[PDB]
Amino acid sequence: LSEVLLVSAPGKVILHGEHAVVHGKVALAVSLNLRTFLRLQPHSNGKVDLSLPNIGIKRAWDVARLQSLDTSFLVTTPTSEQVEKLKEVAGLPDDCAVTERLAVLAFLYLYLSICRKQRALPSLDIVVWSELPPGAGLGSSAAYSVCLAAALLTVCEEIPNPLKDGDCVNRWTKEDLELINKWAFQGERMIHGNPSGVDNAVSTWGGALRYHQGKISSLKRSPALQILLTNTKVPRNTRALVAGVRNRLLKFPEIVAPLLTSIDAISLECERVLGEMGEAPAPEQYLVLEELIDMNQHHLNALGVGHASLDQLCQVTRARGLHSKLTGAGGGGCGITLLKPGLEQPEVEATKQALTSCGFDCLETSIGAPGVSIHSATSLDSRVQQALDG
């Protein structure tokens, strides 16, 4: 019971698979509970305005001015004609920051695509703030595109509001989520040429996703694991990192091929343990988990995609009985560390602090969390809506 909408979706990280999948292997994409939020509210004032505090940008549009356009030019929906016209509607000042130019065109594209079937363009105050470190291959984009999706579907009533009962959170039905997915994926294409769809799927469905040769599959429910996201703030060129492995594979086939196969076996095994774990996470299960992380990390190193920072990330953590492994392109970026139950909270804090006393960013979150959701504008942290208010 509420016209005002509060939706959130998680970003994504690769647990196992990093560079193997590019070669026919199995990757395991999990949701990173470093959630992104969207506050949607219908106004009487004929104006649609977008506020993204995280980036410090705010834009608005005269609903009247938008309704005017014969926005009928709306499968490969991303058209040169479309994107072009959309920029006209946009109003992005000539020389404009790349980041917000994409943030706005994804909004407009979606606003106009869904509010399209609406007898009249609604006037709403949009605000999106995220917990997700921007530009670290964490999927902050699709978390966004997923929220602007779920929210806009709910408003236009193309999809029902699942909160309708009296909880603090709730999720759409299986059918609606698919609609939410197909839509977000669209903005994603509106921005990232030819994305795979792993990021939106993760943000939409949450939990664990399996990625093979072009296809995606959800994993049998397995509880969310507590981790430690670590950013080494060390820049890196994903495209280059992926070429280094392609070249290293051509040069050393009889050597790398098997290596890939061992990574593959790792995802397979992790998948197994996750599943069987779903039930009662027994110590052996975590052991096995830390065990897989070590091997994957070293394998990734053998592929020559590791880095001084990561070796440090892994060393500082290992000295304390915790295991870490880079996630993503490698060569810097972020890493993952697994916290199993039992470990004294402070010692989890100390480890957190050590990583920071390196010039590293280290947030304690969880992996394999819920997925796109909606909340009662009274729950969550206070520093959250404050960032969505102030």
Q: Where are the domains of the chain?
A: 1-221+370-390, 222-369
User: Which DSSP helix (H) or strand (E) runs through 162?
Assistant: none
Residue that has been written with the tokens 């014969």 in this structure: 70
The one-character DSSP state at 23 is G
Residue 311: CB partners within 8 Å, gap ≥ 6?
none
- As a whole number of angstroms, the distance between CA 358 and CA 356 comes to 5
What is the Cα 313 distance to its own chain's centre? 22
- As a whole number of angstroms, the distance between CA 24 and CA 330 comes to 19
Q: Which long-range contacts (CB under 8 A, 24 or more apart) does 74-82 make?
A: 74/112, 74/113, 74/116, 76/189, 77/113, 77/186, 77/189, 77/190, 78/186, 78/189, 78/190, 82/109
Residue 61: CB partners within 8 Å, gap ≥ 6?
47, 48, 49, 89, 91
Structure tokens at 266: 């790792």
Structure tokens at 103: 């943030």
**Cβ atoms 19, 242 nearer than 8 A:** yes
Q: What pairs with residue 12 in β-bridges? A: 31
The CATH fold assigned to 222-369 is Alpha-Beta Plaits (3.30.70)
Residue that has been written with the tokens 């979150």 in this structure: 365
Structure tokens at 319: 């000295």
Cα atoms in the Cβ-side hemisphere of radius 13 Å centred on 192? 18
- As a whole number of angstroms, the distance between CA 29 and CA 327 comes to 10
Structure tokens at 217: 């599959």
Could you tell me which of 340, 225, 335 has the C-alpha nearest to residue 286?
340
The CATH fold assigned to 1-221+370-390 is Ribosomal Protein S5; domain 2 (3.30.230)
Residue type at position 264: D
**Cβ atoms 38, 63 nearer than 8 A:** no
Annotated binding site: 12, 54, 130, 135-141, 188
Collapsing DSSP to helix, strand or coil, 18 comes out as coil
Phi-psi region of 119 (alpha: psi -120 to 50; beta: other; left: phi over 0): alpha
Collapsing DSSP to helix, strand or coil, 4 comes out as coil
- As a whole number of angstroms, the distance between CA 278 and CA 42 comes to 41
Structure tokens at 303: 């592929």
Residue that has been written with the tokens 């509607």 in this structure: 89
The one-character DSSP state at 224 is P
Residues annotated catalytic, as ranges: 141, 199
Could you tell me which of 225, 205, 224 has the C-alpha nearest to residue 216?
205
Structure tokens at 214: 């072009």
What is the Cα 353 distance to its own chain's centre? 25
The torsion of the CA quartet 207, 213, 215, 216, rounded to 10 degrees, works out to 0
What φ, ψ does residue 184 adopt, rounded to 5°? -55, -55
CA distances from 362 to 59, 187, 327, 385 (A): 32, 30, 14, 23
User: Which DSSP helix (H) or strand (E) runs through 121?
Assistant: none
Could you tell me which of 249, 257, 12 has the C-alpha nearest to residue 144?
12
Buried b (16+ CB within 10 A) or exposed e, 223-256: ebbbbbbbbbeeebeeeebbebbeebbeeeeeeb
Annotated binding site for Mg(2+): 141, 188
Q: For the chain, where are the alpha helices, taking DSSP H only?
A: 63-68, 80-90, 98-114, 140-155, 174-191, 198-205, 238-251, 253-278, 283-302, 308-318, 345-356, 382-387
- As a whole number of angstroms, the distance between CA 60 and CA 76 comes to 28
Structure tokens at 269: 């095994």
Buried b (16+ CB within 10 A) or exposed e, 257-285: eebbeebbbbbebbbebbeebeeebeeeb
Q: Kindly report the length of the chain.
A: 390
Using CB atoms within 10 Å of the CB of residue 299, give its burial: 0 to 12 exposed, 13 to 18 middle, 19+ buried.
Answer: buried
Collapsing DSSP to helix, strand or coil, 198 comes out as helix
Residue type at position 386: Q
Resolution in A, one decimal? 2.5
Residue that has been written with the tokens 């080494």 in this structure: 232
What is the Cα 278 distance to its own chain's centre? 23
How many of the other CB atoms lie within 10 Å of CB of 143? Answer: 32
**Cβ atoms 71, 38 nearer than 8 A:** no
- As a whole number of angstroms, the distance between CA 80 and CA 63 comes to 24
- As a whole number of angstroms, the distance between CA 87 and CA 112 comes to 13
- As a whole number of angstroms, the distance between CA 231 and CA 80 comes to 36
Concatenate the DSSP letters of all residues of 318-382 into one string. HTTT-EEEE-SS-SSSEEEEE--TTS-HHHHHHHHHHHHTTT-EEEEEEES---SEEE-TT-S-H
